[PDB]
Design a protein around this ligand. Structure first.
Ligand SMILES: CN(CCO)c1ccccn1
Length: 119
């Protein structure tokens, strides 16, 4: 029932994601010199360094907000991909599966802790 535990749990999960080779295309904002049309398709860029910085700044109130930004990294890759077989998109799907597998208990524990706080 620790309402604050999610933050360190998210820091640890981001550390695992950064050490994963599949995260390399997503560690920093998409390079607009490499992909000149990126902002014509994607309205809201997102990357894991921005998520980590937002967390460290104390600018996430809940793990749901962090999860919405991580999911935006993956939906941006899906929207930008020219093919469902592209290398970077394929990396995003594996990384998404890994993230969802680990974030589920973080979300459950936080929501349970908040319900206990308001019992
Ligand atoms: C650079 N990225 C992330 C786009 O958000 C790509 C590139 C090709 C296919 C899919 N995602």
């Amino acid at each position: 029932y620790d309402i604050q535990a999610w933050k360190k749990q998210c820091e640890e999960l981001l550390n695992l994601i950064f050490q994963c080779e599949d995260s390399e295309p997503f560690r920093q904002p998409v390079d607009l010199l490499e992909y000149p049309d990126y902002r014509d398709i994607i309205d809201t860029p997102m990357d894991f360094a921005t998520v980590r910085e937002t967390l460290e700044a104390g600018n996430y109130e809940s793990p749901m907000e962090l999860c919405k930004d991580v999911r935006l990294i993956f939906s941006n890759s899906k929207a930008y991909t020219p093919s469902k077989r592209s290398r970077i998109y394929s990396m995003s799907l594996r990384l998404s599966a890994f993230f969802e597998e680990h974030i589920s208990s973080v979300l459950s524990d936080y929501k349970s802790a908040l319900r206990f706080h308001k019992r």
